[PDB]
Write a protein that binds this ligand. Structure first.
Ligand SMILES: Nc1nc2c(ncn2[C@@H]2O[C@H](CO)[C@@H](O)[C@H]2OP(=O)(O)O)c(=O)[nH]1
Ligand SMILES: [Ca+2]
Length: 104
C-alpha cells in the first residue's frame, strides 16, 4: 500500500524519510542542487494547516526512489522545517499552474 500517494506516485514512509534527510542536510550546509535551487523556502501560498512550525523548505521526492541530484525535479515535494520535522508531502499533479495540493 502507499503511505503517501501523489497522483500516480506511491511513496512509503522510508521514501519520505530518505528524501527529507537529503534535503535537510543540504539545507544545513547552505548548498543547492539543480536549476531550481533545492532545497528552497516553501511559502505556503496554499495556506495548508501544517502541524509543525514554519519556516518551511521544499525538496523534490522522486517516483524512481532515487535521491534528487539535478535535472527534472518532477512534480512531487517533501516539505520540512528547521527542526527537521516533516510538514507534509505535496504535488503540482492535479493542481492548476504551479499551485500544489497535498498527497493523500
Ligand atoms: N505554488 C507554490 N509554489 C512555491 C511556494 N514556495 C515556493 N514555491 C515555488 O515557486 C514557484 C512559483 O510559485 C513554484 O513553482 C515553486 O517551485 P517548485 O516548482 O520548484 O517546487 C508556495 O507556497 N506555493
Ligand atoms: Ca519507494
Amino acid at each position: 500500500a502507499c503511505d503517501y500517494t501523489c497522483g500516480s506516485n506511491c511513496y512509503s514512509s522510508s521514501d519520505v524519510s530518505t528524501a527529507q534527510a537529503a534535503g535537510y542536510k543540504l539545507h544545513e550546509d547552505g548548498e543547492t542542487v539543480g536549476s531550481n535551487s533545492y532545497p528552497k523556502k516553501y511559502n505556503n501560498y496554499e495556506g495548508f494547516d501544517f502541524s509543525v512550525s514554519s519556516p518551511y523548505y521544499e525538496w523534490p521526492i522522486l517516483s524512481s526512489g532515487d535521491v534528487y541530484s539535478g535535472g527534472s525535479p518532477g512534480a512531487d515535494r517533501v516539505v520540512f522545517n528547521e527542526n527537521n520535522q516533516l510538514a507534509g508531502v505535496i504535488t503540482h499533479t492535479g493542481a492548476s499552474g504551479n499551485n500544489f495540493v497535498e498527497c493523500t
